[PDB]
Design a protein around this ligand. Structure first.
Ligand SMILES: *[C@@H]1O[C@H](CO)[C@@H](O[C@@H]2O[C@H](CO)[C@@H](O[C@@H]3O[C@H](CO)[C@@H](O)[C@H](O[C@H]4O[C@H](CO)[C@@H](O)[C@H](O)[C@@H]4O[C@H]4O[C@H](CO)[C@@H](O)[C@H](O)[C@@H]4O)[C@@H]3O)[C@H](O)[C@H]2NC(C)=O)[C@H](O)[C@H]1NC(C)=O
Ligand SMILES: *[C@@H]1O[C@H](CO)[C@@H](O[C@@H]2O[C@H](CO)[C@@H](O[C@@H]3O[C@H](CO[C@H]4O[C@H](CO)[C@@H](O)[C@H](O)[C@@H]4O)[C@@H](O)[C@H](O[C@H]4O[C@H](CO)[C@@H](O)[C@H](O)[C@@H]4O)[C@@H]3O)[C@H](O)[C@H]2NC(C)=O)[C@H](O)[C@H]1NC(C)=O
Ligand SMILES: *[C@@H]1O[C@H](CO)[C@@H](O[C@@H]2O[C@H](CO)[C@@H](O)[C@H](O)[C@H]2NC(C)=O)[C@H](O)[C@H]1NC(C)=O
Ligand SMILES: *[C@@H]1O[C@H](CO)[C@@H](O[C@@H]2O[C@H](CO)[C@@H](O)[C@H](O)[C@H]2NC(C)=O)[C@H](O)[C@H]1NC(C)=O
Ligand SMILES: *[C@@H]1O[C@H](CO)[C@@H](O[C@@H]2O[C@H](CO)[C@@H](O)[C@H](O)[C@H]2NC(C)=O)[C@H](O)[C@H]1NC(C)=O
Ligand SMILES: *[C@@H]1O[C@H](CO)[C@@H](O[C@@H]2O[C@H](CO)[C@@H](O)[C@H](O)[C@H]2NC(C)=O)[C@H](O)[C@H]1NC(C)=O
Ligand SMILES: *[C@@H]1O[C@H](CO)[C@@H](O[C@@H]2O[C@H](CO)[C@@H](O)[C@H](O)[C@H]2NC(C)=O)[C@H](O)[C@H]1NC(C)=O
Ligand SMILES: *[C@@H]1O[C@H](CO)[C@@H](O[C@@H]2O[C@H](CO)[C@@H](O)[C@H](O)[C@H]2NC(C)=O)[C@H](O)[C@H]1NC(C)=O
Ligand code: NAG
Ligand code: NAG
Ligand code: NAG
Ligand code: NAG
Lengths: 150, 698, 698, 149
């Protein structure tokens, strides 16, 4: 909605998304995905492959460990490429996603905890950074995703 | 809980870290390859060291997970790939010795030099100097010098290194629960498919033997035609019935017969297809060539090249001060980054090479959706088979006429088709017995069927009986002639080139059948055909997620490797070769040699070890010196190295012949050597404490 | 009218047309040397070809004028110089063959390589690779490998070329009415002076023999001291009585013993004179060095350097991308143009070299007033003698203390003087027997006193008896050891280095006597001496207008070459060496060799030609192989090249010894070879149809 | 005496002079030779034979070229001219006579381009000066003006 939400210089990760309490959206034509499913706006810098993970009724790493969409329609899904802001030649590892949970989330449950989970015989961090290189394919370039709800 | 969930979690973490580490290593390698300098090599070194350490650590972790419990095929395949290669069981000194041996063999191969007989300051390397001689020269003696200087100044250095390398690699492969290093190389083409008949490692050996027995008649007729053709340019060196000398085959190893095309061309007045003039006309550049290749791949229904591909790839040689390697390569960097690095000149060869590398890139983009372990070809031959089949479909004269590159006034008669098919067969059919025989020799060496004292004997035995190629100079166990090839000295498998041709022509026949081609198979173009492209994309999408037999049965309808499409491709050429080989002899005998007519049989009648061989060679050289001094008044310094021993039974008999010093091609006539033995019979007979009845000298 | 007037007219025309095109050839050569390019080579070659054609044409014209009918000395000297060298009488094919032989010898010397026994891909050239080993290494076996690889892979190539070169040059010199090529080289130092005793060409040979006999005791004591010091390093390799091995002398040929200074330095705790730190301090540059040299030359009364000298000469390495040859040279371009081309660094060696080349330039400007034929040194040694005597006078510690480059706190004791004198003697005294012996060998080879079948025998005989240097490996007539030197392979006279050393110290003693020096001769400085500079300028002003004997009698008061000043220069060092060599043995015997103790004498009792020698060497190698196989259980491939024959009487007797394959330093002990002969005696005596009594094998 | 004589752009050769029918000369200090012992003759003789202009010696220029009587009533001027009459590649536009059959009297001139005999072949008696910029003072062009009263 507001310009401050969409034009934020610093934008939060997939797991720790921060919420805030229309003709330009239609005619901007920079939005790669335009499917519309108080004003709260969420914060996703998910990969281009994982843009389709922000949709009801599916599975995946984001869909079953990160932010989850319930089985009803509430808001609008917007997404655009961001290879110029948060993608570098040496990589931009400033965004994290949650690779594993003990149980699948509730339709809007969120946790920003930093626990180590068991892999093999060692304990490793459940938060892994995103490799956002500028010279990467469309499925691996950073996509700036905002969903909304009222 | 259950271990397959733990395996899934471990595989997810491994993919998440590996897609990052390998992308960084690929970026460093690209930065070095497009910009050669210092402070760029060590970046690749540290990136590759980090990736290798991570890979071996995760392989040691993956060895914990059992495979017989897991029922899901994808995770089982990924774990099999992870567990098949890891940290070797070799000790630190053994691993260091193996690395030193490999580096020494590579350095000897790359930096070895051969000096001319006269002018010892003129020494030629392999790549700019000796390759030009073996590819272009029509002189028997210069080719013989270049062929014999190699494998003697270089292969003799590689013989003990290869002897230790075989033992070390056999120990390393036995530590991986394999019989030998050949079985470890044949761990590819190994499937665990359903219903019971999984492809085993011995099935590959059985199949390549069957394929060679099926291609033997066409290769025999091509061999007879080539022998009859170069009997004209080497009139007094080629036997009409015997094998071909190894140094008259277009290169030093006889791998490809392509350079023999000007010698063996039928209908030489007919010009070959070459559209290089039409591309230096019409303003064709590198970008035009790659856009035409992209248009060809769009026409079958494959996706476009990515926007990053046109930006980041090195489609032409850089004009600034950035040294590069000028080898055409298609790069799958990872994370959707696909680039082509080649120095494109405006030539038809670069046009076909651009199509080949775009085929590689299309394969990469097709299997990029798979997990990282499965992002490869179905086996090691599939990738190059796909590249070569796209290059095959592109290079038709119909395609060039459709593009407007070839003039429409050109007429395709039966003479030009025969020339094209023969030029294809010198590269495709002529390389198959050599590849099969070399891989067979390496498999029997690693297995232990060939003992260390019979390496050269067995090698030059199957060279005569399989390839139909005879050595011009006898080679004892001090030589290492396989190690004179790049892939043997640099530890590379060779059967992928054998299977590439079979899979390539199988794919060509299948795609031409789908694209409703009705004429001969060699005049088929799959352009603007969406069904052939759809089935090709279905084949390319499954990288390693299933068995290669299942993918092959999906695309061509057969679960096994079949050479029938290859014989159907060369059928008009086979008929023409059978017509031409009517007054000639088809086949070869393994008895004739260039030195066989002038050799003298020596029968040992009675401890005749290698020192007695040396004393015999020295006595023969002294007799030759005395004969040439006392008969022709010539001072020729014959040595023990100028006496060549062949057909050596261990204590029964052998054959010997004498060559001149400084001219290995100049074999002394048998009458001269017989007179030399007769004149100096007393010293030769007395030096071994025997009479003339013991040493027959027939 | 009189032939004097026509000769004067011809000489005027010749010098007028010779100064031109001499300046042009000099300018083209300067443009090439200061700016190396393929474009600059062609202008040099054109100018040189024009000058050579003009010179030979004018020499053919000058042959018409007879020398017997002219009484003016200057015209007679110019006409004699013109007539002595001209168009050779050799045929066109003979001249072409001689030019090809000279070019082949130069190319073999410049491009010859020696490869190590292990790692055959590591081959070293002489100039960057083998020279470093011969100058720096203290390893006996590495030095032996470098010394033996040279003269075997290079000298053996040069042996037939030198054999033909000697015949061709002898014919060419006989066409110039000389006895041989040695007489043609000795056409310098030939005067027609008044009153009767003109210097002849045989007088030079008599004088150099007398000078060598006079310098024999000092060289003997220096040789004894160097042998005693190189008995500490290289133990069990140096005989305390016999000669010195040829490969332990500081370079490849033993020409200079300068690199032996760290091993033979007395009082090693005393630092040598080196003001390089004091010139990287105080802001010294190349211009400062050359201005100091000009100040030194002005201080004795010699004129200033010309304005064109500072303007045009390359006094430092060019910053821009211009390739130069980094060799210090003084150029007399002609028409009053004098330049110095050298890449000056801030070092004491470059300081002394700047003084040397500026002495060359001062000689050039001194004789520039003479006609063009007479603008040279009095003989071929005078120019370098003048340069080296200026370098001698400028290198004293008193001069450096006066200049300020040396701190006044430095004290000159007797220990530092001995170190300086020994460092001088290793370059000055150590090079005189080598130079004398090499010129004697070349003179006897050209004269014909040494037959072609005794070249190496005679060469190593006078190396043993004159230089006191023994070969470490026997060399037969297949070797050419003199041709391994630069001046022999590139057709350069060598006696100028011998005469330069005599004239150097003669001039030094004369100028120090004039400059009222009262101390020892080695601490003498001729700076601020107008009388010494006046007499030096009187000597340098006459280039070739008079006899060199007259000029020498003018400057030093003696008409003959005298080595007494040289012995007076080294008198404190001679006394110290006599005091050091009391417990040592002074002198050498010509019987000991490194291989002499392990050689086996073989006596022939009865057609034993070279083929029988080859058969004997092969039988010995077979016996060594059998002995090492059956005794030590070792397989070592001994060959006929590993058996060395020395002291070969033609049919009476010889000595042989065996070296290990791939280690010419590893001589097999005599007991092992004797056991090898005893074990395999039957085959050895049977191979030549004799018993064990005839071949004694003592 | 006049500025046109001294500042003329082209001076002809020594064998072919150009005669024409003082505080500046004293204080100019550009003249290397200013020795005296209105017709002004012009030469481009070389540096080492500037002293040849003076009366009472022999040589090449002294006899075969311009020759001075035993008694003289004029001045001799000469200055270095490497900037004008010398070039990097050589300036060969000035010639000197090398030989005559008889010795010259004081003050006469000949322009005849005759040849003469040396050795066995005939060649011209006129030889061109090789004037290079990178040459010494003895081999540099010197413009010489001699006055006669
Ligand atoms: C030093 O070396 C250089 C190398 O370049 C020499 O420089 C060249 O010198 C020649 C000298 O002949 C000069 O050629 C002159 O160039 C002009 C035309 O290009 C003319 O001025 C002149 O023509 C005369 O000579 C012709 C040939 O003889 C005659 O046909 C013609 O009539 C001209 O008149 C002269 O000759 C006739 C003979 O019949 C006579 O009657 C006249 O009086 C008169 O004497 C020349 O061809 C080149 O131009 C010079 N090259 C350059 C690049 O400058 C130089 O000469 C050398 N110096 C010495 C001393 O050897
Ligand atoms: C591909 O491979 C490369 C190899 O070069 C990786 O590069 C790594 O980049 C990451 C991200 O920058 C670096 O990881 C670092 O880890 C730490 C994470 O926090 C630790 O500490 C907290 C306590 O506060 C614990 O709760 C938690 O569990 C962790 O143990 C931090 O130290 C780093 O964050 C800080 O980085 C620098 C260093 O101070 C600061 O400037 C930043 O502001 C920030 O605070 C950081 O995240 C890692 O060091 C890099 N390695 C190397 C060798 O360079 C890529 O990330 C990798 N990509 C993937 C997807 O694996
Ligand atoms: C080609 O390579 C050179 C040297 O390897 C690169 O120069 C480096 O450039 C980076 C850019 O960040 C600098 O940080 C380094 O200091 C440079 N190194 C040196 C030794 O100068 C050069 O940039 C490369 N060229 C391209 C086009 O990538
Ligand atoms: C078959 O594919 C080819 C390209 O390989 C197409 O050939 C040309 O296409 C252009 C662009 O439409 C036409 O203008 C030309 O006339 C075509 N040349 C031909 C047919 O020789 C072609 O369009 C494809 N076939 C069809 C039916 O579209
Ligand atoms: C080396 O020997 C070969 C074989 O004798 C020489 O090549 C020619 O051989 C044919 C017969 O095969 C003769 O008729 C020719 O006279 C030989 N010489 C030439 C020049 O053709 C060959 O010349 C010998 N030498 C070299 C240097 O290769
Ligand atoms: C160094 O040598 C090069 C090549 O010989 C010189 O380049 C030539 O310069 C001249 C100047 O008159 C030109 O006429 C030529 O055309 C140039 N040739 C080439 C091939 O470029 C260069 O000038 C020389 N440098 C110096 C400082 O003398
Ligand atoms: C002798 O020559 C030396 C230089 O080699 C002169 O030494 C210096 O000369 C300068 C210039 O005249 C004097 O100012 C310094 O005092 C001298 N240095 C020393 C340390 O004395 C020296 O002057 C010359 N001798 C004479 C008499 O002129
Ligand atoms: C070549 O042989 C020499 C001489 O035998 C070896 O050098 C040393 O020789 C001394 C006696 O002179 C022995 O005590 C040493 O053991 C020898 N070896 C060393 C390493 O010092 C030499 O090693 C041999 N090999 C090579 C490659 O030069
Ligand atoms: C491929 O590129 C062409 C030309 O830019 C474009 O028209 C076409 O739509 C692209 N194809 C696909 C599948 O994106
Ligand atoms: C390709 O290059 C162009 C021109 O510099 C640029 O506009 C475009 O964004 C680039 N695309 C990439 C780097 O993916
Ligand atoms: C030499 O040059 C120096 C420095 O210019 C000068 O002072 C001195 O007078 C000159 N000497 C002579 C003899 O010209
Ligand atoms: C000396 O060099 C200077 C500076 O380059 C230059 O101006 C002058 O003409 C030169 N003088 C000569 C060559 O006499």
């Amino acid at each position: 909605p507001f310009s401050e939400v969409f034009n934020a210089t610093t934008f939060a990760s997939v797991y720790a998304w921060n919420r805030k309490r229309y003709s330009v959206l239609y005619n901007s034509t920079s939005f790669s995905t335009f499917q519309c499913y108080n004003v709260y706006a969420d914060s996703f810098v998910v990969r281009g492959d994982e843009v389709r993970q922000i949709a009801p009724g599916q599975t995946g790493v984001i869909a079953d460990y990160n932010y989850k969409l319930p089985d009803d329609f509430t808001g609008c899904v917007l997404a655009w490429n961001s290879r110029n802001q948060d993608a570098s030649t040496s990589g931009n590892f400033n965004y994290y996603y949650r690779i594993w949970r003990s149980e699948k989330l509730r339709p809007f449950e969120r946790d920003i905890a930093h626990y180590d989970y068991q892999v093999g015989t060692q304990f490793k961090s459940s938060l892994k950074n995103y490799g956002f290189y500028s010279s990467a394919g469309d499925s691996h370039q950073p996509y700036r995703v905002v969903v909304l709800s009222f | 809980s259950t271990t397959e969930d733990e395996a899934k979690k471990f595989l997810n973490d491994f993919n998440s870290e590996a897609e990052n580490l390998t992308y960084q290593s690929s970026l460093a390698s690209w930065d070095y390859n497009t910009n050669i300098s210092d402070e760029n090599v060590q970046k690749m070194d540290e990136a590759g060291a980090k990736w290798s350490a991570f890979y071996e650590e995760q392989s040691k972790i993956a060895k914990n997970y059992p495979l017989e419990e897991i029922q899901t095929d994808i995770v089982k395949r990924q774990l099999q790939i992870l567990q098949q290669s890891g940290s070797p069981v070799l000790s630190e000194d053994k691993s260091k010795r193996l690395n030193s041996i490999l580096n020494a063999m590579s350095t000897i191969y790359s930096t070895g030099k051969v000096c001319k007989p006269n002018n010892p300051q003129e020494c030629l390397l392999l790549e700019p100097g000796l390759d030009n001689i073996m590819g272009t020269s029509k002189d028997y003696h210069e080719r013989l010098w270049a062929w014999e200087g190699w494998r003697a100044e270089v292969g003799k250095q590689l013989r003990p290194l290869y002897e230790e390398y075989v033992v070390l690699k056999n120990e390393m492969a036995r530590g991986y629960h394999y019989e030998d290093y050949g079985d470890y190389w044949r761990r590819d083409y190994e499937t665990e498919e359903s219903s019971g008949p999984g492809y085993s490692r011995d099935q590959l050996m059985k199949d390549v033997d069957r394929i060679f027995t099926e291609i033997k008649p066409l290769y025999e007729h091509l061999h007879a035609y080539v022998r009859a053709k170069l009997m004209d340019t080497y009139p007094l060196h080629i036997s009409p019935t015997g094998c071909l000398p190894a140094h008259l085959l277009g290169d030093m190893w006889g791998r490809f017969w392509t350079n023999l095309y000007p010698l063996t061309v039928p209908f030489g007045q007919k010009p070959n297809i070459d559209v290089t003039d039409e591309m230096v006309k019409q303003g064709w550049d590198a970008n035009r060539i790659f856009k035409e290749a992209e248009k060809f791949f769009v026409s079958v229904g494959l996706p476009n090249m990515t926007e990053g591909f046109w930006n980041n790839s090195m489609l032409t040689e850089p004009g600034d001060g950035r040294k590069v390697v000028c080898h055409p390569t298609a790069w799958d960097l990872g994370k959707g980054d696909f680039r082509i690095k080649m120095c494109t000149k405006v030539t038809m060869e670069d046009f076909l090479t651009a199509h080949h590398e775009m085929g590689h890139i299309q394969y990469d983009m097709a299997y990029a959706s798979q997990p990282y372990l499965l992002r490869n070809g179905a086996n090691e031959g599939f990738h190059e088979a796909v590249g070569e089949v796209m290059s095959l479909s592109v290079a038709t004269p119909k395609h060039l006429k459709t593009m407007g590159l070839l003039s429409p006034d050109f007429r395709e008669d039966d003479e030009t088709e025969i020339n094209f098919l023969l030029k294809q067969a010198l590269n495709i059919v002529g390389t198959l017995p050599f590849t099969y025989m070399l891989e067979k020799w390496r498999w029997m060496v690693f297995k232990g069927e060939i003992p260390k004292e019979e390496w050269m004997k067995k090698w030059w035995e199957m060279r005569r009986e399989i390839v139909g190629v005879v050595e011009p100079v006898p080679h004892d166990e001090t030589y290492c002639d396989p190690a004179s090839l790049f892939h043997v000295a640099n530890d590379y498998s060779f059967i992928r080139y054998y299977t590439r041709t079979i899979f390539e022509f199988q794919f060509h026949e299948a795609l031409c059948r789908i694209a409703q081609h009705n004429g001969p198979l060699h005049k088929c173009d799959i352009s603007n055909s969406t069904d052939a492209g759809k089935k090709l994309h279905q084949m390319l999408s499954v990288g390693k997620s299933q068995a290669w037999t299942k993918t092959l049965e999906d695309i061509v309808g057969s679960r096994n490797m079949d050479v029938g499409p290859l014989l159907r491709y060369f059928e008009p050429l086979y008929t023409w070769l059978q017509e031409q080989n009517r007054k000639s002899y088809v086949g070869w005998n393994t008895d004739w040699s260039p030195y066989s007519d002038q050799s003298i049989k020596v029968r040992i009648s009675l401890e005749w070890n290698d020192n007695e061989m040396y004393l015999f060679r020295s006595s023969v050289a002294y007799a030759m010196r005395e004969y040439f001094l006392k008969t022709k008044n010539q001072t020729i310094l014959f040595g023990d190295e100028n006496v060549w021993v062949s057909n050596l039974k261990p204590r029964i008999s052998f054959n010997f012949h004498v060559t001149s010093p400084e001219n290995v091609s100049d074999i002394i006539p048998r009458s001269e050597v017989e007179g030399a033995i007769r004149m100096s019979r007393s010293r030769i007979n007395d030096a071994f404490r025997l009479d003339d009845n013991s040493l027959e000298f027939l």
